[PDB]
Write a protein that binds this ligand. Structure first.
Ligand SMILES: CCCCCCCC/C=C\CCCCCCCC(=O)OC[C@H](COP(=O)(O)OCCN)OC(=O)CCCCCCC/C=C/CCCCCCCC
Ligand SMILES: CCCCCCCC/C=C\CCCCCCCC(=O)OC[C@H](COP(=O)(O)OCCN)OC(=O)CCCCCCC/C=C\CCCCCCCC
Ligand SMILES: CCCCCCCC/C=C\CCCCCCCC(=O)OC[C@H](COP(=O)(O)OCCN)OC(=O)CCCCCCC/C=C\CCCCCCCC
Lengths: 717, 704, 316
């Protein structure tokens, strides 16, 4: 079988010696069965039960039949022949059977046999594994080969957890060796003592005078001398056997075989993290060292966790090839080439083989190490770290210091944020997501944001309570700061006035309920949305006229109960988005704003829609959705530039036919409302297509079929 | 399968051992017979003859038989088959002792395995046809395996010594067996005279016995003697073959004569002995193995694979241009340099990146159009004709020394070299680089750029100062010292020192009397007080002291007026003096991303200015005299603290570029139409400042 | 047939002891065939059908031919030598052959053999199933291994329904064990009570006086003493056999093997929903536990329905 690797040289030698001893036993047994006898002749002259030894020579007449001679031979062989000279081959046979049972006990005893079979099987499979050859040479990996390597690596780990608990094999081997040497000692003692009793000439005084006529006889045992030399040869083998056993016993007392240090292999091989196994693992490894150290060398690279990491990385490279990665390539909000790597063990080098990538997104990868080949990704500008501990090196830092101008870091822990990200020389856009306030780490996680002198966008979803002054210093070039805090008020304290270059101050979910003077002191602010800040009243728009650049007041998602009529003073806004509020009615004053191009009043309590909505010639999209609005005035239809009319879920009675003046209508929502039937003018709008005319179907069917056919032909041609 | 290492003598001895074992078994079976000796007593108590009545029972006869068998028959005649069995067991055990040793068997298996891999490899007959895709890769892998075998088995000599030991043991055992068997074969006699003293048991003292199978045992002994004689003659021939010629060395000189390859060396020790063994088996194996042993044949295989992998059409695809307008071939992480690359003769520049262990042949003499060479992190070798041609032709070199030896030592045998790009790193013992100070052989060198952590300027530069003109050094945080080596610059014109950590401008720069330009990049110049000697640099027009820490600017600027380019971007200057703008020849003045409080009016003196950058300053006041200077082509005043763009700005006719980005402005005047060279791109501003032009001015401005 | 997993240490020990009893039987039978003779000498002095046993001694002359001696030997061997000394090897042959038959009956009987092979096949397939390794490691799963795991799951459920209804295997193993232990008791009783009748010296009284001239003879049985050692040493083996069988009986009366508890394995593993199996499947899981715990721990994962739900949602 396959247990040849388990048996060392001493086991093979003892097996051969046992075979020769069994040959001795068989030969002696056949000779004892067939030809062992005594040839006894009576002593004619007997003096006190002793052979007295007292023309032409003539033979002695004993007057005995052949059968009386046979009786004398049998009686003297039974009685006055020593038991050793008779049962030497049977004793040899018994001793060989016990020796063979002891030598092969662990291969038959099920508890040890299962462990030995498991160890031998996985060891032979790891020896024959191609990943062994790759590891010793250290690639082209067939998927059967790769799955074999991973599964058998997991098998090795499971076998270690299964066999490291017990030490039954070592104990059984020790007991077998001890029994084999103590029985050796007993065999030598009793065999050497009684070997002189195998004599050729034997005197027998058996007292059968009433049956033969003589009392003393002088027998000659023919198979004595031969038996003697056989015994001598047997003793020789036993001595050799004993010597071998002693060496094995010494081999199991020189060092603790339950502690196999992997020292030589881990110094020789690159993987220096190979842990030192214990107990039966160590003992079977020592046995396989005695057989062939190459087995242990090839099995060592399958236990080290550095080999775990390298095999895992190379397997990752083999799984995710470049072609499916190109298939998976997508684009971000900025229309830039992005790659969403979600739940990966690492970054494959197939990612880094690219040269046109600009947005490297890394999502939930455990403690990855970035190789330098990122420098090949020549167009790389963005980088997304979401729950990813990133480890990077110096050429990577060089290419990111000369190319990378964006860095998007999402985290839930301080250690997830790497310390390299503060050494970039071209960093411009930067969103930190996750809490940045901690012990010795409140804005001291990221204290290297002074080193970044080209930042322009800073989004902070961090549950923040205060703003660092260093951000205010950076703001000479920074132009956008959006802080998300999940309902935490910051202490501004007018420390934001160094925002000369800031253009978009976006306080998302700030819950301020008030407007500090720093908001309307910063002359370059153009985008102002106080979203979810629970403004009951907005009263600080009057001081905004020193700020010449405000163009878009997207006051949405707020508790604003009313708009003061002074809102009519403004003229310069375009995207006036006052949606998701509690406005009771839109005023005519709000339509004094002539530059409005976009008006969103969704989810309000507007009583009706006045006519002065038609004062908006440049207005493109209009969303008065979720209001209480019944009629659209003809003045609204004098405006030729209405495109996106989200008018649904309303109480609209009808659209006056002056809507035929409309030309640029593109998207309208009418699921809802109270429009009794479709005016055909809704079908007249050219830019309004089936995708834009989100309308009920029955009132569409009320239209003439040929107009529907014209619209259909415009859709399909 | 170890049969390939069993010669005729070993097989013959194995079969003789089997025959001797058969003889021993047959002899033991004959010894099994009960009736062995037959004894009759001596002097027992047409012619009619009568039998002699010995007066003995059958048991007396049997007793006499066993007594005379034990005490009169010679021990040889009784134990010869057992001795034959023991001797043949010893012969069988000691005949496989070379094969079944632990360390020897692995070497034997490795040798026969890779030799069979040879005998089945296509690259062997392919290599003979060379002498006279996938298979090439398998050839290269088998060649690495052959080198592994050379480093794995050739060291030891266990196999030869072990075989010699087993042969000597066989010979001495044969001698002992022949001697004692021939001595004792005369004791196997039919008639035996037995004289046991059993007169008290039987009545007689002298017996004549016959050993029944004495003739059979005599024939068996003679047959065993013949078998052992043949075995010993075979073992003596084995000894003669082992020691008549030195089997510790094997000469491949027969292959040297047959195969045209002469790089094929003569291996020794176990390699030699096993080659002799397989030569006893089959002489073709060693001859075919030799073409795999040599390494010049390996170089030929590497060249063949290099030419096979990259077709010239693939090189046409690879053809591109570089930073110096030359035809570049980017070769990345290659095994070597193909000759197909040199087949292209229109090539102007070679790019070799981490292609190490590469030897440049004479074939580069094909392409005469080379002017640039990019030898990046690659240890390259050379040939004589390549030295001559690249001495004659090559002029531009760009190497990267990641390792000091990855810098090859032959760059310096050239003379026509003009440009050098010494990117990489250096250690503490800078002066020991004799590779640097061999550029005395270079006569045409004019461009030297050393991106390395160089603390001491070598005496190399001191020697080559006569013809060198441009320096570009990036220390990257390393302090540069020992500036006398830059003092003894004489004919140098350009000096760009980056991150050299030079606290003060040395007298080295002023020792230069013909320096066209100076760069003190990333150098911590806190104060500038040594400008007094800067007047000696009459050729100095460029002073690019940017990203610097000059806190104030003194009067010493009056020493040199030939200054034209003046970059103090990101400087620590607080207020400009009255004394900068006296030097009217200045045209190119930079103060980008500084923090100047305000601009004094003495700027009116700089008329020949064509570039005035003060971007990202704290300047709140621009006096109208810079608007009075009309020769000012570029004028960057971006992100300052100014208030209103000047209405009388159309007077500047030659105002090509006015970067005033991020300035707090209110309304643009209508006189931008009077400006002949100012655009929306030129006047970069925030868009709410762009939206301010009158409608007729929009009509005149959209049409420029 | 890979039935070694169904043989615990007691079964292997009894198999080896039965092999050595086979060797006893063959050796003793060969000796009793070839060289079991009797050497009988007439008692010259007769005292009421019994042996009286009363310068240079002279041999006693019986005036018997060699054929009369052979006739006396045969008659006193058949009539007077005790039958144990004549038929001990045949009895040990018969006894150890019945022991082998009892050991291998459940392996050769088709009703139990088919079920044994069916269970062994699916246990070996589940032991090498990749899903078992994945779940004990517990989603990555190839389509083909998922298909083979689902097929093995359906096989496991169908074979559970096929086998859990009956308990013939446990019953047969029980019956074999009781037969072996009672035969051990019977063998020990009769062999120990009859081992004393193997004597070297036997007085024979066969009344062939008309054919020989003597009535009482004294006989030597040369192969008696050896048989005695054989018998005694054979007895020792049976004792060990019985003791081993005793433990087996105790094991199969220690706990109800027809109910297997996965309590430890389902407690230590994540899957706490592993059902308790019954009857034959329980007995063979117990035998496999006696062989190796890891086989039972690994097969535990193919029976829980939470593992089935996890496999379904991973496959989905
Ligand atoms: C592990 C335990 C092994 C013991 C098993 C024993 C197996 C055999 C036992 C049964 C033997 C049957 C015979 C018993 C009564 C003997 C009858 C008898 O005396 O016959 C005579 C005859 C000898 O003939 P002679 O009269 O000398 O002939 C001279 C003219 N050519 O005796 C015998 O040998 C009996 C023949 C039966 C053969 C059985 C085997 C005999 C032994 C074979 C040994 C051969 C081994 C050779 C290899 C040794 C070295 C590797
Ligand atoms: C160390 C342990 C040693 C064990 C041996 C004990 C020996 C003690 C001596 C006892 C003794 O004297 O009894 C004698 C008695 C015979 O002599 P009697 O005529 O009764 O007495 C006359 C004395 N001249 O001999 C004995 O009892 C010796 C016992 C020896 C036991 C040998 C064991 C043999 C085992 C049989 C196995 C055979 C299997 C063969 C397998 C065949 C496979 C094909
Ligand atoms: C090295 C070269 C060795 C040289 C010779 C070795 C033997 C030396 C001989 C010593 C000697 O003469 O002593 C005699 C001495 C006893 O002789 P007697 O018969 O008493 O002498 C009667 C006087 N005519 O003879 C011997 O010892 C013979 C030598 C050993 C013979 C057998 C050796 C091996 C024995 C084991 C046999 C193994 C077979 C197993 C069979 C397996 C079957 C399944």
């Amino acid at each position: 079988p396959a247990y040849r690797i388990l048996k060392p040289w001493w086991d093979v030698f003892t097996d051969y010696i046992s075979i020769v001893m069994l040959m001795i036993a068989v030969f002696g047994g056949t000779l004892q069965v067939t030809q062992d006898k005594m040839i006894c002749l009576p002593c004619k002259w007997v003096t006190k039960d002793s052979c007295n030894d007292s023309t032409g020579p003539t033979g002695i007449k004993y007057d005995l039949d052949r059968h009386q001679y046979n009786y004398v031979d049998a009686v003297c062989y039974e009685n006055r022949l020593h038991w050793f000279a008779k049962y030497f081959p049977y004793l040899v046979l018994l001793h060989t059977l016990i020796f063979l049972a002891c030598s092969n006990f662990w291969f038959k005893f099920p508890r040890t046999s299962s462990k030995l079979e498991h160890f031998v099987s996985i060891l032979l499979k790891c020896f024959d594994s191609p990943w062994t050859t790759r590891a010793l040479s250290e690639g082209v990996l067939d998927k059967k080969e790769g799955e074999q390597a991973k599964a058998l690596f997991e098998k090795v780990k499971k076998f270690r957890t299964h066999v490291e608990e017990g030490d039954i094999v070592y104990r059984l081997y020790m007991r077998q060796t001890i029994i084999k040497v103590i029985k050796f000692a007993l065999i030598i003692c009793y065999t050497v003592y009684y070997v002189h009793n195998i004599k050729f000439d034997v005197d027998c005084t058996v007292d059968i005078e009433s049956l033969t006529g003589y009392r003393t006889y002088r027998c000659a045992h023919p198979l004595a001398t031969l038996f003697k030399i056989l015994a001598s040869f047997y003793i020789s083998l036993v001595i050799f056997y004993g010597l071998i056993c002693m060496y094995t016993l010494w081999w199991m007392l020189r060092r603790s075989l339950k502690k196999y240090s992997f020292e030589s292999i881990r110094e020789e091989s690159s993987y220096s993290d190979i842990p030192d196994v214990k107990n039966d693992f160590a003992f079977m490894l020592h046995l396989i060292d005695q057989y062939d150290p190459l087995y242990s060398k090839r099995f060592a690279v399958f236990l080290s966790e550095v080999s775990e990491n390298k095999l895992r990385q190379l397997n990752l490279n083999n799984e995710w090839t470049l072609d499916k990665l190109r298939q998976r390539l997508t684009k971000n909000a900025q229309d830039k080439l992005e790659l969403h790597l979600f739940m990966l063990s690492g970054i494959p080098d197939t990612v880094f083989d690219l040269v046109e990538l600009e947005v490297l997104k890394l999502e939930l990868i455990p403690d990855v190490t970035i190789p330098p080949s990122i420098a090949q990704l020549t167009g790389l500008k963005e980088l997304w770290l979401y729950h990813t501990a990133a480890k990077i090196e110096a050429p990577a830092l060089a290419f990111l210091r000369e190319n990378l101008r964006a860095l998007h870091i999402k985290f839930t822990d301080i250690k997830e944020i790497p310390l390299w990200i503060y050494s970039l020389k071209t960093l411009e856009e930067l969103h930190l997501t996750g809490n940045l306030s901690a012990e010795n780490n409140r804005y001291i996680v990221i204290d290297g944001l002074r080193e970044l002198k080209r930042l322009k966008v800073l989004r902070l979803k961090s549950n923040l309570s205060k703003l660092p002054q260093v951000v205010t210093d950076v703001g000479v070039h920074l132009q956008k700061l959006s802080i998300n805090n999940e309902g935490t008020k910051l202490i501004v304290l007018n420390s934001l006035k160094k925002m000369v270059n800031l253009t978009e101050l976006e306080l998302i979910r700030c819950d301020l309920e008030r407007i500090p003077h720093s908001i309307f002191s910063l002359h370059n602010l153009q985008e102002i949305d106080l979203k979810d800040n629970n403004l009951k009243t907005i009263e600080e728009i009057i001081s905004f006229q020193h700020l010449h650049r405000l163009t878009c007041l997207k006051l949405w998602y707020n508790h604003i109960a009313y708009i003061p009529i002074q809102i009519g003073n403004l003229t310069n806004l375009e995207r006036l988005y006052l949606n998701r509020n509690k406005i009771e009615k839109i005023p005519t004053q709000l339509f004094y704003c002539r530059k409005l191009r976009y008006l969103d009043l969704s989810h309000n309590n507007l009583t009706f829609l006045p006519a002065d909505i038609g004062l908006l010639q440049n207005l493109q999209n209009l969303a008065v959705t979720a209001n209480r609005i019944e009629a659209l005035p003809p003045e609204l239809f004098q405006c030729r530039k209405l495109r996106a009319l989200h008018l649904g879920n309303n109480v609209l009675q009808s659209l006056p036919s002056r809507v035929g003046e409309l030309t640029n209508l593109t998207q309208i929502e009418l699921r809802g409302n109270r429009l009794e039937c479709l005016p055909v003018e809704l079908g007249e709008c050219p830019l309004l297509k089936r995708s834009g005319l989100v309308v009920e179907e029955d009132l569409f069917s009320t239209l003439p079929p040929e107009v529907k056919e014209r619209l259909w032909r415009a859709d399909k041609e | 399968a170890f049969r390939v290492l069993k010669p005729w003598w070993d097989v013959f001895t194995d079969y003789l051992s089997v025959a001797m074992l058969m003889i021993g078994v047959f002899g033991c079976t004959l010894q099994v017979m009960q009736d062995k000796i037959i004894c009759l007593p001596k002097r027992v108590q047409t012619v009619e003859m009568k039998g002699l009545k010995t007066d003995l029972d059958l048991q007396q006869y049997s007793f006499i038989n066993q007594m005379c068998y034990e005490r009169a028959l010679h021990w040889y005649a009784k134990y010869f088959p057992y001795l034959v069995l023991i001797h043949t067991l010893v012969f069988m055990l000691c005949s496989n002792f070379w094969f079944k040793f632990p360390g020897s068997s692995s070497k034997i298996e490795h040798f026969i395995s890779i030799l069979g891999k040879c005998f089945d490899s296509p690259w062997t007959t392919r290599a003979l046809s060379e002498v006279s895709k996938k298979e090439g890769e398998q050839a290269k892998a088998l060649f690495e395996k052959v080198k592994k075998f050379r480093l794995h088995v050739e060291e030891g000599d266990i196999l030869y010594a072990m075989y010699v030991r087993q042969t000597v043991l066989k010979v001495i055992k044969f001698l002992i067996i022949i001697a004692y068997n021939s001595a004792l074969v005369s004791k196997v006699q039919f008639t035996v005279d037995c004289n046991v003293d059993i007169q008290d048991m039987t009545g007689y003292k002298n017996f004549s016995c016959n050993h029944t199978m004495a003739h059979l045992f005599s024939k068996l002994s003679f047959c065993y003697l013949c078998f052992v004689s043949i075995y010993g003659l075979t073992c003596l021939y084995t000894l003669y073959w082992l020691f008549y010629r030195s089997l510790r060395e094997y000469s491949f000189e027969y292959v040297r004569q047959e195969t045209g390859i002469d790089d094929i060396p003569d291996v020794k020790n176990d390699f030699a002995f096993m080659l002799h063994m397989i030569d006893q088996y089959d002489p073709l194996y060693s001859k075919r193995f030799a073409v795999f042993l040599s390494e010049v044949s390996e170089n030929k295989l590497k060249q063949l694979n290099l030419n096979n992998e990259w077709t010239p059409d693939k090189l046409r695809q690879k053809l591109q241009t570089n930073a110096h307008n030359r035809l570049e071939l980017p070769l990345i992480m290659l095994s070597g340099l193909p000759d197909t690359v040199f087949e292209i003769t229109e090539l102007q520049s070679l790019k070799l990146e981490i292609i190490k262990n590469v030897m440049i042949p004479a074939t580069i003499a094909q392409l005469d159009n080379l002017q640039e060479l990019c030898l990046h992190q690659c240890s390259v070798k050379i040939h004589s004709a390549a030295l001559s041609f690249l001495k004659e032709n090559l002029k531009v070199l760009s190497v990267k020394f990641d390792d000091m030896r990855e810098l090859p030592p032959w760059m310096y045998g050239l003379r026509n070299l003009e440009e050098l790009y010494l990117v990489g790193s250096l250690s503490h013992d800078i002066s020991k680089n004799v590779t640097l100070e061999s550029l005395r052989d270079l006569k045409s060198l004019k461009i030297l750029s050393i991106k390395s952590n160089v603390s001491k300027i070598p005496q190399a530069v001191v020697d080559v100062s006569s013809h060198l003109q441009k320096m570009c050094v990036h220390n990257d945080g390393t302090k540069l010292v020992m500036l006398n080596n830059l003092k003894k610059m004489t004919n140098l014109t350009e000096l760009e020192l980056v991150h050299c950590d030079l606290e003060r401008i040395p007298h080295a720069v002023f020792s230069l009397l013909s320096l066209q330009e100076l760069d003190l990049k990333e150098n911590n110049l806190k104060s500038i007080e040594e400008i007094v000697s800067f007047q000696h640099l009459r050729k100095l027009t460029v002073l690019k002291l940017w990203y610097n820490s000059i806190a104030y600017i003194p009067e010493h600027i009056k020493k040199l007026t030939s200054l034209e380019r003046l970059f103090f971007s990101h400087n620590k200057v607080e207020v400009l003096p009255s004394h900068l703008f006296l030097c009217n020849k200045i045209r190119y003045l930079d103060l980008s991303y500084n923090d100047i409080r305000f601009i004094p009016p003495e700027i009116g003196v700089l008329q020949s200015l064509q570039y005035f950058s003060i971007t990202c300053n704290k300047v709140e006041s621009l006096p109208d005299e810079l608007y009075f200077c009309k020769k000012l082509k570029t004028l960057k005043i971006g992100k300052n603290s100014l208030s209103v763009l000047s209405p009388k700005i159309g007077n500047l006719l030659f105002l090509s570029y006015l970067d005033i980005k991020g300035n707090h402005f209110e309304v643009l005047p209508p006189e931008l139409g009077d400006c002949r060279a100012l655009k929306r791109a030129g006047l970069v501003v925030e868009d709410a400042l762009f939206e301010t032009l009158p409608s007729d001015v929009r009509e005149q401005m959209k049409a420029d």
